[PDB]
Amino acid sequence: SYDQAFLEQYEKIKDPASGYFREFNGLLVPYHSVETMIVEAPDHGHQTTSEAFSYYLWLEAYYGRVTGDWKPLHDAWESMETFIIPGTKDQPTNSAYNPNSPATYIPEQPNADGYPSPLMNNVPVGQDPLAQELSSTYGTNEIYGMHWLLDVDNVYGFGFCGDGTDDAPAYINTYQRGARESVWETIPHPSCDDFTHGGPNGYLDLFTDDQNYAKQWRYTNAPNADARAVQVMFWAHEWAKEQGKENEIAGLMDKASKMGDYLRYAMFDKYFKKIGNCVGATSCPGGQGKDSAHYLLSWYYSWGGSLDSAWAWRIGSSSSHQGYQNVLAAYALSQVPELQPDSPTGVQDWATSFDRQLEFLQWLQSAEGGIAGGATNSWKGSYDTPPTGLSQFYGMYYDWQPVWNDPPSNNWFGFQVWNMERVAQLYYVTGDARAEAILDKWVPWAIQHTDVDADNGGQNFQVPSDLEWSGQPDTWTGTYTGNPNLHVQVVSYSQDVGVTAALAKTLMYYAKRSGDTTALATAEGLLDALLAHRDSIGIATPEQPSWDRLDDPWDGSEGLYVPPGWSGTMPNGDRIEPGATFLSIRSFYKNDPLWPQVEAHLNDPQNVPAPIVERHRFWAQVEIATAFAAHDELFG
Numbered sequence: 001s002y003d004q005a006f007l008e009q010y011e012k013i014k015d016p017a018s019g020y021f022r023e024f025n026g027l028l029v030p031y032h033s034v035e036t037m038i039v040e041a042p043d044h045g046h047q048t049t050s051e052a053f054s055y056y057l058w059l060e061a062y063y064g065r066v067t068g069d070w071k072p073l074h075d076a077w078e079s080m081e082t083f084i085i086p087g088t089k090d091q092p093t094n095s096a097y098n099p100n101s102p103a104t105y106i107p108e109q110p111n112a113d114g115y116p117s118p119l120m121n122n123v124p125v126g127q128d129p130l131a132q133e134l135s136s137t138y139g140t141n142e143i144y145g146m147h148w149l150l151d152v153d154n155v156y157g158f159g160f161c162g163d164g165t166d167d168a169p170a171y172i173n174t175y176q177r178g179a180r181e182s183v184w185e186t187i188p189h190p191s192c193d194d195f196t197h198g199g200p201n202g203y204l205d206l207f208t209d210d211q212n213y214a215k216q217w218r219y220t221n222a223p224n225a226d227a228r229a230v231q232v233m234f235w236a237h238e239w240a241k242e243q244g245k246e247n248e249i250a251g252l253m254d255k256a257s258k259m260g261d262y263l264r265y266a267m268f269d270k271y272f273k274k275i276g277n278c279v280g281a282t283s284c285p286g287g288q289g290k291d292s293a294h295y296l297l298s299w300y301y302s303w304g305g306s307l308d309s310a311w312a313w314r315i316g317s318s319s320s321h322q323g324y325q326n327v328l329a330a331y332a333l334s335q336v337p338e339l340q341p342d343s344p345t346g347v348q349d350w351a352t353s354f355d356r357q358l359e360f361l362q363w364l365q366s367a368e369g370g371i372a373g374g375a376t377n378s379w380k381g382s383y384d385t386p387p388t389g390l391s392q393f394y395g396m397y398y399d400w401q402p403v404w405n406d407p408p409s410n411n412w413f414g415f416q417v418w419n420m421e422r423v424a425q426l427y428y429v430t431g432d433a434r435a436e437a438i439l440d441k442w443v444p445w446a447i448q449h450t451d452v453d454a455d456n457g458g459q460n461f462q463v464p465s466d467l468e469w470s471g472q473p474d475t476w477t478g479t480y481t482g483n484p485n486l487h488v489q490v491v492s493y494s495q496d497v498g499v500t501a502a503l504a505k506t507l508m509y510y511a512k513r514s515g516d517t518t519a520l521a522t523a524e525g526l527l528d529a530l531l532a533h534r535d536s537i538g539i540a541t542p543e544q545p546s547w548d549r550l551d552d553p554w555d556g557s558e559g560l561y562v563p564p565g566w567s568g569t570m571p572n573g574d575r576i577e578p579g580a581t582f583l584s585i586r587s588f589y590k591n592d593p594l595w596p597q598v599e600a601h602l603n604d605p606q607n608v609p610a611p612i613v614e615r616h617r618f619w620a621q622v623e624i625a626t627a628f629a630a631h632d633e634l635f636g
């Protein structure tokens with residue numbers, strides 16, 4: 001059965017010999033991937049992510065469904081609380097936070113050479129309308145949200161506030177320098193910077209131009225991941241309830257609702273500006289109450305404070321991407337009593353968001369059916385002037401590439417299925433007509449660009465990989481025009497197993513509710529294809545990544561920028577200075593088992609091809625397991 005396939009894949013993921021996790025005192029921390037040399041969002045395989053933790057929850061929730069044993073889900077939640085939701089030690093000075101003055105504006109710059117970027121006190125910042133309510137609800141000033149990125153094996157050497165120890169995964173961060181700073185162009189740094197490493201002011205003055213530098217901590221949420229963790233717990237509820245075990249997980253449901261309460265920070269403009277036609281940083285007014293809410297799952301929220309006359313700050317984020325939205329989580333938080341937040345306005349906010357996210361997704365639906373990028377309340381991240389005639393959604397501006405422009409953030413087909421699966425899941429649960437309309441146009445488009453290779457057992461199946469967008473939606477006036485002038489074309493295909501599994505699920509949920517037989521046939525062909533690519537530790541297919549940026553210094557537009565005159569060292573002694581490269585500040589990479597093959601290709605790229613690898617990404621391997629489990633959930 002596929003429930004046999006689920007359990008086989010589950011067992012591989014959880015077998016210590018496979019290498020998916022590091023164990024710390026009985027608790028498991030998943031890696032980004034089994035393989036160490038991987039550069040895509042994290043920049044090392046044995047970093048990990050709040051994403052991975054959300055997928056770890058998902059895997060154990062399906063394990064509960066299948067077996068009735070909910071203790072592995074508890075374990076996974078305990079691990080999250082221990083290692084990636086900052087504890088008091090990690091975020092110690094939230095008492096200094098002033099919600100009436102949440103942050104000082106710093107403009108985002110157009111390229112990495114604009115950093116460090118200065119504080120601007122003449123730009124109005126709004127009031128934060130969440131903080132006092134969260135404190136009153138939970139009895140703490142701390143944030144209950146995952147930080148996005150850990151260094152699980154301490155490959156970078158940061159440790160805990162600079163101590164270099166490897167007793168727990170290190171809290172670290174990379175992206176800091178705006179839209180044009182790719183994964184290849186960051187300077188990894190500790191979230192808690194006591195100046196042990198880096199330059200004389202740690203790493204702080206690569207990023208922020210301030211007259212004084214103080215030791216401080218800061219964290220960043222990945223709302224795509226915290227919303228997925230809530231979505232997982234909706235399902236744990238459902239599946240435990242069918243078993244008469246809903247009581248075994250009632251504490252975990254409480255804690256997911258708490259996560260969801262704090263996740264509202266993602267719904268706000270970065271600097272709590274009023275939403276809509278927010279053009280000119282000194283002109284766009286500060287928000288009052290919830291007029292700074294866009295009610296979408298934006299790219300991040302972040303918070304920090306002095307390590308120590310304490311100061312502290314919080315930001316939302318102004319730009320939202322279709323691939324992050326989670327209408328299933330929004331439905332759960334707004335309408336399922338077991339997941340409704342305890343704060344007096346949490347439920348209302350999530351009910352507004354549920355509605356708003358579905359309108360946003362429909363507004364972004366192209367002529368062909370794919371979902372375009374998103375929209376922002378802060379053009380270019382400095383409240384800049386967008387082009388005249390640019391499309392709008394609730395006064396925000398259409399952005400075909402929200403947040404990341406290296407690469408354009410919505411060119412990956414993966415975000416289509418990550419969003420769409422959640423839309424399909426809603427449609428399965430409630431029959432939501434709004435979800436159904438999106439799906440009825442998207443599903444054919446996706447099917448039309450999928451090849452399950454049925455006559456050949458899925459050996460050479462293919463799913464969409466890279467998308468090319470053009471045009472813009474019509475401005476939203478509360479009705480779908482069909483967006484005849486917003487276009488997408490598929491320009492590359494892959495065998496990406498993670499994307500495959502999410503596509504298969506999307507199609508299955510949709511088929512279950514609609515009865516659509518073409519959708520189910522495609523899904524079934526994709527699941528066969530996955531089974532055809534089993535190996536000892538999971539399911540994997542060949543990929544051939546590119547590596548040519550690893551040795552690129554700054555050339556005036558691309559490569560690793562360091563400010564003239566700036567000098568510092570990484571924990572291993574690697575020199576951070578002008579003319580450094582991705583590799584030169586990550587010199588440990590030269591000991592990686594893949595390194596010789598990478599360098600041999602870069603030495604002679606006409607004659608030595610780039611290595612072809614078969615990678616085991618945690619999230620992808622879980623995605624697969626969940627696709628197998630979903631099949632039997634939906635179809636027996």
Ligand SMILES: OC[C@H]1O[C@@H](O[C@H]2[C@H](O)[C@@H](O)[C@H](O[C@H]3[C@H](O)[C@@H](O)[C@H](O[C@H]4[C@H](O)[C@@H](O)[C@H](O[C@H]5[C@H](O)[C@@H](O)[C@H](O[C@H]6[C@H](O)[C@@H](O)[C@H](O)O[C@@H]6CO)O[C@@H]5CO)O[C@@H]4CO)O[C@@H]3CO)O[C@@H]2CO)[C@H](O)[C@@H](O)[C@@H]1O
Nearest residue numbers: 103104105106148175208210220221222299300302311313
């Ligand atoms: O007034 C009392 C004293 O004030 C002191 O000045 C303080 C001031 O009070 C305070 O407000 C100010 O706070 C700023 C911080 O210094 C600054 O570091 C922080 O920068 C944010 C930045 O705005 C934001 O865009 C950036 O977002 C990154 C994020 O870090 C990163 O994790 C995320 O990555 C995502 C990946 O892109 C994605 O692929 C993945 O899936 O998810 C990741 C997570 O979402 O990407 C985003 C966007 O690129 O985060 C940084 C923080 O890391 O901004 C604060 C507010 O402006 O600090 C001042 C100190 O300079 C005075 O010094 C003193 O005189 C006063 O008395």
Ligand SMILES: OC[C@H]1O[C@@H](O[C@H]2[C@H](O)[C@@H](O)[C@@H](O)O[C@@H]2CO)[C@H](O)[C@@H](O)[C@@H]1O
Nearest residue numbers: 040041042049051412414496498499617
């Ligand atoms: O940034 C979104 C997700 O990217 C995932 O990596 C993708 C990558 O972007 C593609 O170019 C291709 O390489 O496939 C990868 C695996 O699907 C990354 O693994 C996730 O962590 C990100 O959320």
Ligand SMILES: [Ca+2]
Nearest residue numbers: 161162163194
């Ligand atoms: Ca220290």
Ligand SMILES: [Ca+2]
Nearest residue numbers: 180181182406
């Ligand atoms: Ca760049």
Ligand SMILES: [Ca+2]
Nearest residue numbers: 436437440514
């Ligand atoms: Ca229909």
Ligand SMILES: [Ca+2]
Nearest residue numbers: 548549551552
């Ligand atoms: Ca190069």
Ligand SMILES: [Fe+3]
Nearest residue numbers: 162163164571
């Ligand atoms: Fe050190």
Ligand SMILES: [Fe+3]
Nearest residue numbers: 254257338339
């Ligand atoms: Fe509750």
Ligand SMILES: [Fe+3]
Nearest residue numbers: 383384385386
């Ligand atoms: Fe301008």
Ligand SMILES: [Fe+3]
Nearest residue numbers: 448449489490
């Ligand atoms: Fe086509």
Ligand code: NA
Nearest residue numbers: 248249250251
């Ligand atoms: Na319990």
Ligand code: NA
Nearest residue numbers: 254255258342
């Ligand atoms: Na509670």
Ligand code: NA
Nearest residue numbers: 524525527528
């Ligand atoms: Na089959």
Ligand SMILES: [Zn+2]
Nearest residue numbers: 011012015016
């Ligand atoms: Zn085993």
Ligand SMILES: [Zn+2]
Nearest residue numbers: 068069070071
């Ligand atoms: Zn039990």
Ligand SMILES: [Zn+2]
Nearest residue numbers: 074078251252
């Ligand atoms: Zn417990």
